[PDB]
Amino acid sequence: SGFRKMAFPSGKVEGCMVQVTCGTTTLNGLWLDDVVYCPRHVICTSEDMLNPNYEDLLIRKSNHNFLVQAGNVQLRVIGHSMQNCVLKLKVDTANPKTPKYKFVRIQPGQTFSVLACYNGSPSGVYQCAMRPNFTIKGSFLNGSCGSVGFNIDYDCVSFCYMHHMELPTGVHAGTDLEGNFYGPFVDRQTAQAAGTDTTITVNVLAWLYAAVINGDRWFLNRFTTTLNDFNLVAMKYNYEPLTQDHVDILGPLSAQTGIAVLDMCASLKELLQNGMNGRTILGSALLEDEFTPFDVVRQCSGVT
Amino acid sequence: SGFRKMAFPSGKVEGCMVQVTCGTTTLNGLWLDDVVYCPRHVICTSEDMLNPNYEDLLIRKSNHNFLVQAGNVQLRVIGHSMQNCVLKLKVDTANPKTPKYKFVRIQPGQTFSVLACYNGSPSGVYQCAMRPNFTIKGSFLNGSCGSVGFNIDYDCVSFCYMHHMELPTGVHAGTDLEGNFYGPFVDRQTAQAAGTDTTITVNVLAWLYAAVINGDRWFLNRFTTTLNDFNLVAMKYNYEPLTQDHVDILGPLSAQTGIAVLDMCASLKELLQNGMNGRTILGSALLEDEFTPFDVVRQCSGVT
Ligand SMILES: Cc1ccncc1NC(=O)Cc1ccc2nc[nH]c2c1
Ligand SMILES: Cc1ccncc1NC(=O)Cc1ccc2nc[nH]c2c1
C-alpha cells in the first residue's frame, strides 16, 4: 500500500547522457547508437536567441565545433544535420550502453519521467505530465537543455521529450526526439504565452481510484452523474471534457474497485463544488492530475 | 526555474538489486562487493511473521536455501549471517557494478530516494523523508521488501534504508543497512502503532525559500517573530520545534533571498493560522515538508 509520484528507474537513460558544447554554449545531448541528439539552440549565444536564423548560424559550424564528451572521454563528430529543432551529431562510436529505444510523440495528459542533467551529468529524476496547453512544469536551470523525458516498457525506453525553453512565465517547452515542439512554441526568446492550463480529468479520476485502493475513501458519496452533466461542471472548473474513450480507459480501475466510473465522476463533481474542507487525499490538498490510468494500474500492481 | 520533488538518479542502485528467495518467500537484496543484504524475514512464512524466533528459524536454513539471482544469472552463496534484522549473504562473486558506497543511519526529517523493486527488478523511484515518528510514507506492495533508500554525493551512494514492514495503518517501517530499525518498530506482525506524525518545520521553511526563489511570493508578509513565539504556534499545529541549529542551517537560503529566517517563520505562522485560502505554493495546497534545506540548495543550484 501507499501511492507515490513515481518516476521510472533512470539508469538506462543515464547511460545515454553526454555533454555538448558549441562555442560558449554547453548543454546536454542524448547518445543513442552513433548519433547524439541535442537542441539546435546549442549553436546560439543568448543574444542570438532573440531572433535566430538557425540555417544561417549553422553554416558557420563544422563537425569539429561540436564538442561531445561522454564522462571524461571525447567523442569524434563525423557529421551533423538539423532535423526540425534538434541537431543530430553523427559520432564515430556507437554508445555501448544504448538501450532498446523508440521515439514517440506523446499526447497532452500523458505522463513521463525527466532526467534533469547539467554538463551531461544527471542531477535528478522526477515525474511530470504534458499539460493540455503543451507546456510542462519541470525543474530546469541554465544548462539543463537537452535533458529528456521518457517512459519505459520493461526494457524499451520510449523517449518523448527533449528540453529546450523556459517561457517568461516559468513553465517549460520542448520537442519530441524528431525535433518538433509540443504545442505552438518556438526556439526563440520572444513573447510566447501559454494557453489555459486545464486539469486532466481522466488522470484525476484515475488518482481517485488509487486513493480508494490505498484506503482514502472519505470523498465517496451517494451520488451518480452522466458524462454530459459532469462535463458542465468540468467546463466551469477548467477541467478537460471527459469522453467515452476516457470512461473505457478507466474500466479496469472501475472493475477492480467496484465503483462505476460515473459514480466516481459524481464524487469528483462534489469535490469541485464543495472543495476539500481542509481534508487530504493521498497526502494532497488538491486534485492530482499527473497520474494516468495506466500509471495507477502499473503502480498498484508493481510492474517492473 | 521550477521546483520539483526530485529523486536521485537511480542507475548506481539499479546495478545492485538482486532477487533473494528462501522457501516460498521472494524479496529484494542489495549486492555490494561480495555480500547481498536483505531483510531477515525472507526466512519466514506469513504465518511465522505473527511470532517469529529468527535465530531458531535461521538454524534450519543452509547457504543453498538462499537463492540469489542477479538478472537471469544465479549467484553462489558461500556464507550467511544475521546482523540485527538483516541477513548478509556472502556470495563468491563481487558485484562488478558496485559503486562507491557508505552505510549511514539518517535522522528524522532527512530525505532520501527509494528505488522500489519486485523480484530484484526496479519498478520506480521516488523521494521521501524519514518522518519524526520514524515511519516513511512509501509505495510498497508484497515483494517490495529489501528495496532501499539512499542519497548520492557525486559518485558515492549512502544507503540509509531497507524496506521491511507495512504497519496495519499503511505506513512503512524499515532498517538502516546495519539492520537496526528506525524507531521502535520490529519485524513481527503485531500491534505496532506509530506516534504523532509531526511536520518537519525546518523543511517547510526551506521549501518556502524555494518558493520565493522560483517566483511564488504571495505568502510573504510584513511581520517577524521570535523562535519562542513561533514555537508556541508550532506546538499548536503539531510542527517540530525550530531550534537555533535549524536557523543556522537555513542561513544560506536566507542570504540568497535576503529574507531573514525569523521573517520566514512569521510567514509560516500566518499560513498556519489563516490557511492557504484556496491558494497554492509551488503547485501544492499544503505546506510541503519533504525537502531539506540541503535539497533546496542542491536543486536550486543544479548539483550533479
Ligand atoms: C535559460 C533556460 C533555463 C531553463 N530552461 C531553458 C533555458 N533556456 C531558454 O529558455 C532558451 C535559451 C537561452 C539562452 C541560450 N543560449 C544558447 N541557447 C540558449 C537557449
Ligand atoms: C506485505 C507487505 C507489503 C509492503 N511492505 C511490507 C510487507 N510485509 C510486511 O509488512 C511483513 C511481511 C509479511 C509477510 C511475510 N512473509 C515473509 N516475510 C514477510 C514479511
- What region does A240 belong to: left with phi over 0, alpha with psi -120 to 50, or beta? beta
- Do A204 and A241 fall within a single domain? yes
CA distance A120 to chain B (A): 9
CA distance B57 to chain A (A): 28
Nearest to A122 by CA among B210, B7, B296, B4: B7
Residues 151-210 of B with CB under 8 A from A: 166, 170-172
- Do A7 and A21 fall within a single domain? no
Question: Cell 529524476 sits at which residue?
Answer: A125
- Do A245 and A216 fall within a single domain? yes
Q: Which residues pair with B136 in a beta bridge?
A: B172
- Do A78 and A21 fall within a single domain? yes
Contacts 24+ apart (CB under 8 A), A43-47: A43/A87, A46/A189
Count of Cβ atoms closer than 10 Å to residue B269 Cβ: 22
Taking CA atoms, A4 is separated from A211, A283, B121, B173, B236, in Å, by 11, 9, 18, 16, 28
Q: How much distance in Å is there from the Cα of A285 to the middle of ligand 1?
A: 33
- Do A104 and A8 fall within a single domain? yes
Helical H segments across chain A, by residue range: 11-14, 54-59, 201-213, 227-236, 244-249, 251-257, 261-274, 293-301
Return the amino acid letter for B179.
G
- Do A7 and A153 fall within a single domain? yes
Which domain CATH number covers A161?
2.40.10.10
State the total domains in chain A. Answer: 3
Q: From the alpha carbon of B172, which atom of ligand 2 is closest? A: 5
Residues 34-53 of A with CB under 8 A from B: none
Integer Cα distance of B262 and B265 in angstroms: 5
Is B41 one of the catalytic residues?
yes
Is B117 one of the catalytic residues?
no
- Cβ of A9 within 8 Å of Cβ of B115? The answer is yes
Contacts of A224 (CB under 8 A, 6+ apart): A260, A262, A263, A265, A266
Q: What is the pairing mode between strands A156-166 and A100-103? A: parallel
Domain that holds residue A49: 15-99
- Cβ of B9 within 8 Å of Cβ of A11? The answer is yes
Chain B residue with CA closest to A138: the answer is: B2
Tell which of B43, B69, B99 closes a domain: B99
Which domain CATH number covers B221?
1.10.1840.10
Record the cell numbers describing residue B78, joined without a space: 558461500
CA distance B230 to chain A (A): 22
Tell which of B165, B197, B229 closes a domain: B197
Record the cell numbers describing residue B37, joined without a space: 543484504
- Do A158 and A271 fall within a single domain? no
Contacts of A92 (CB under 8 A, 6+ apart): A34, A75, A76, A78
User: What ranges make up the beta strands (E) of A49-180?
Assistant: 66-70, 73-75, 77-83, 86-91, 100-103, 111-118, 121-129, 148-153, 156-166, 172-175
Record the cell numbers describing residue A194, joined without a space: 501559454
Tell which of A67, A99, A131 closes a domain: A99
- Do B94 and B137 fall within a single domain? no
Nearest to A287 by CA among A237, A251, A225: A237
Integer Cα distance of A80 and A176 in angstroms: 19
Question: What are the φ/ψ torsions at residue B167 (nearest 5 degrees)?
Answer: -75, 160
Contacts of A9 (CB under 8 A, 6+ apart): A152, B10, B11, B14, B115, B122, B123, B124, B125
Return the amino acid letter for A174.
G
- Do B26 and B36 fall within a single domain? yes
Q: Which residues of A are catalytic?
A: 41, 145
- Do B204 and B275 fall within a single domain? yes
- Do A71 and A109 fall within a single domain? no
- Do B22 and B159 fall within a single domain? no
Question: Which one of B9, B115, B116 has the shortest CB-CB distance to A122?
Answer: B9
Buried b (16+ CB within 10 A) or exposed e, B57-84: bbeeeeeeebebbbeeeebebeebeeee
Resolution, expressed in angstroms to one decimal: 1.4
Nearest to A239 by CA among A182, A287, A170, A184: A287
The number of C-alpha atoms within 13 Å of B283 and in the hemisphere containing its C-beta is 18
